């Protein structure tokens, strides 16, 4: 999974 | 990890000047670059995102440009509120920051006043001797301080401390403290600190003889 | 508006644990990811961890992986950082930051809190020793004399220094503390006064170390050489 992807 | 480096580390400027800070990345981060501003004792504040997009509420004198590995932050018409440290940050792969660029107030070059303090008799009873060299009210901040004991250069037994820029005269002050045991302090005579600063035509020496004063 | 308040920072021995909190207000906390970022001179600005809005996806920096755990309680609008097996290099100011509401392929943080300070050391609490930095012929230039006090071997930070109980403030320079190899801090506070006032004016430095409940007054006597 991408850490910089949408976390909201 | 993507390494972020800023240039310069310290920028000297005046109100009204147009200044530019440079940020470089170890590998391409596309346009995923953010700029923040931090004042001493305060939190970072977002200024620019996506390299060029201004955050809402940030004045239009802040503008950004750049892509890939090289980026710039430009402040057009510096205001007193703009004197602070600015950090770039990549968010392409995790989050890494630059070391920071401090924007300071530029003033005329002022040479330091060099004073030396031998250890007190009260400290010597405790078994330690501290010699303090004081560089007072100098600009710019770059200065070289070396300790010589009986003409022998000292290494690894001194610590330096510098104040932030003074709010009234825009100067810096620095202290260098040579720490020795009581027994090692008592076997030498001449204790001297040598100061190199732009305001001085040549290195300046401030010395004392142990026990004379 | 958006408000983030950190708490929990304290002095902790190496190898022990500490729990930090970030209490949020002014935004719908349950809809945003949250970050922990730390700051120190040896580390600059260093990202620590991120947690997704629901508390499932968590990523950590290698420097803390296996020792720090990030969590959140959305019913309390509170973010947590559980720090285990703390090291001296973990000493820093710890900030909590909200992930921004900017829709794009990549995301970062916008709003930061005020920060809470974590100091990891094995040193015991100790009040400072105050030694005079006496004025002399070697501390004079143009009718102005420099004098000061050496505040040495105290733990932990901070100390406050005043001169003549606050009556003398102009020309004062209290330097930032340095950490000695013994683990104890030391600093000096100096002031420039007219040489002509050395015989007429008494000068005393006032050092307070609240962690040790230590208040010290030290008269600096002028030297006749």
Residue ending a domain, choose from B84, B105, B126: B105
For residues B119 and B96, membership in a common domain is answered with no
Inform me whether the C-beta atom of residue C51 falls under 8 Å from chain A C-beta atoms.
Answer: yes
Token pair recorded at residue B115: 């004073």
**Chains with at least 3 CB pairs less than 8 angstroms from chain A:** B, C
For residues B98 and B119, membership in a common domain is answered with no
Residue ending a domain, choose from B80, B105, B130: B105
CA distance B45 to B71: 19
Give residues 1 to 8 of A whose Cβ lies within 8 Å of C.
1, 3-8
Q: What is B95-151 written as a DSSP string? A: -EE---EEEEE----BPPEEEEEPPPHHHHHHTEEEEEEEEEEEBSS-EEEEEEETT
Pair B67, B29: CB distance under 8 Å: no
Tally of domains within chain B: 2
Pair B178, B154: CB distance under 8 Å: yes
Which residues precede a break in chain C, with C-to-N distance above 2.5 Å? Answer: none
Inform me whether the C-beta atom of residue C95 falls under 8 Å from chain B C-beta atoms.
Answer: yes
For residues B52 and B71, membership in a common domain is answered with yes
Instruction: Give me the count of residues in chain C.
Output: 225
Residue C156 preceded by cis peptide, ω within 30: yes
For residues B97 and B120, membership in a common domain is answered with no
* CB-based contacts of B144, cutoff 8 Å, min separation 6: B194, B195, B196, B197
* CB-based contacts of B183, cutoff 8 Å, min separation 6: none
For residues B120 and B202, membership in a common domain is answered with yes
Phi, psi of C212 (to 5 degrees): -100, 0
Output the CA–CA distances (angstroms, integers) from residue C1 to B189, C26, C30, C94, in the order listed.
64, 5, 16, 21
Q: What is the strand order of the sheet B152-153 is part of?
A: B152-153, B143-149, B190-197, B204-209
Token pair recorded at residue B167: 């709010």
For chain B, the farthest-separated pair of C-alpha atoms sits apart, in whole angstroms, at 66
Give the residue numbers spanning the domain of B184.
Answer: 113-209
Secondary structure element (H or E) that encloses residue B66, with its range: strand B62-67
3-state secondary structure chain C: CCEEEEECCCEECCCCCEEEEEEEECCCHHHCCEEEEEEECCCEEEEEEEECCCCCCEEECCCCCCCEEEEEECCCCEEEEEECCCCHHHCEEEEEEEECCCCCCCCCEEEECCCEEEEECCCCCECCEEEEECCCHHHEECCEEEEEEEEEEEECCCCEEEEHHHCECCCEEECCCEECCCCCEEEEEEEEEEHHHCCCCCCEEEEEEHHHCEEEEEECCCCCC
For residue B169, the domain's CATH number is 2.60.40.10
For residues B166 and B100, membership in a common domain is answered with no
State the pairing for strand pair B128-138/B113-117: antiparallel
Pair C79, C21: CB distance under 8 Å: yes
Resolution in Å, one decimal place: 2.2
For residues B18 and B90, membership in a common domain is answered with yes
Token pair recorded at residue C71: 């969590």
State the pairing for strand pair C144-154/C129-133: antiparallel
For residues B88 and B11, membership in a common domain is answered with yes
CA distance C225 to C94: 50
What does the DSSP 8-state code read for residue B81? G
Token pair recorded at residue B110: 């002022």
Secondary structure element (H or E) that encloses residue B184, with its range: helix B182-186
For residues B97 and B123, membership in a common domain is answered with no
In which residue are the tokens 């320079």 written? C173
CA distance C162 to C216: 11
CA distance C31 to C52: 9
Give residues 147 to 206 of B whose Cβ lies within 8 Å of C.
159-163, 173, 175, 177, 179, 206
For residues B23 and B61, membership in a common domain is answered with yes
Residue of B nearest to A4 (CA): B94
CA distance C152 to B129: 11
Token pair recorded at residue C142: 């143009």
For residues B94 and B134, membership in a common domain is answered with no
CB spacing of B92 vs A4 below 8 angstroms:
yes
For residues B41 and B85, membership in a common domain is answered with yes
Domains plus CATH for chain C? Answer: 3-120 (2.60.40.10), 129-219 (2.60.40.10)
Residue ending a domain, choose from B67, B89, B105: B105
């Amino acid at each position: 999974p991408d850490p910089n992807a949408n976390p909201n | 990890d993507i390494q972020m480096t800023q240039s310069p580390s310290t920028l000297s400027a005046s109100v009204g000047d147009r200044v530019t800070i440079t940020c470089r990345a170890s590998q391409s981060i596309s346009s995923w670059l953010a700029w923040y501003q931090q004042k001493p004792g305060k939190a970072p504040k977002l200024l620019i995102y996506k390299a060029s997009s201004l955050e809402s509420g940030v004045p239009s004198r802040f503008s950004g440009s750049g892509s890939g590995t090289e980026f710039t932050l430009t402040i057009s018409g510096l205001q007193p509120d703009d004197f602070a440290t600015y950090y770039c940050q990549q968010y392409n792969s995790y989050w890494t920051f630059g070391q920071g660029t401090k924007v300071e107030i530029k003033r005329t070059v002022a040479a330091p006043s060099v004073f030396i303090f031998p250890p007190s008799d009260e400290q010597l009873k405790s078994g330690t001797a501290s010699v303090v060299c004081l560089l007072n009210n100098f600009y710019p901040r770059e200065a070289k301080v070396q300790w010589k004991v009986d003409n022998a250069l000292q290494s690894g037994n001194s610590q330096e401390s510098v104040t932030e820029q003074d709010s009234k005269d825009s100067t810096y002050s620095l202290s260098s403290t040579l720490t020795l045991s009581k027994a090692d302090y008592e076997k030498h005579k001449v204790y001297a600190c040598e100061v190199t600063h732009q305001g001085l035509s040549s290195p300046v020496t401030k010395s004392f003889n142990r026990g004379e004063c | 508006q958006v408000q983030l308040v950190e708490s929990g920072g304290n002095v902790v021995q190496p190898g022990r644990s500490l729990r930090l909190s970030c209490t949020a207000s002014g935004f719908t906390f349950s809809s945003y990811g949250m970050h922990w970022v730390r700051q120190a001179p040896d580390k600059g600005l260093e990202w620590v961890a991120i947690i997704w809005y629901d508390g499932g996806n968590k990523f950590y920096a290698d420097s803390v992986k296996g020792r720090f755990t990030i969590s959140r309680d959305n019913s309390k609008d509170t973010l947590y950082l559980q720090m285990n097996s703390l090291r001296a290099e973990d000493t820093a100011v710890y900030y909590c930051a909200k992930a921004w509401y900017k829709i794009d392929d990549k995301y970062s943080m916008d709003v930061w809190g005020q920060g809470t300070t974590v100091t990891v050391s094995s040193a015991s609490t100790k009040g400072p020793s105050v030694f005079p930095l006496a004025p002399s012929s070697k501390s004079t230039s143009g009718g102005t004399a420099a004098l000061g006090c050496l505040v040495k071997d105290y733990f932990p930070e901070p100390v406050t220094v005043s001169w003549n109980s606050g009556a003398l403030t102009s020309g004062v320079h209290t330097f930032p503390a340095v950490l000695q190899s013994s683990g104890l801090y030391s600093l000096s506070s100096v002031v420039t006064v007219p040489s002509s006032s050395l015989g007429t004016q008494t000068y005393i430095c006032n050092v307070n170390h609240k962690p040790s409940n230590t208040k010290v007054d030290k008269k600096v006597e002028p030297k006749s050489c």
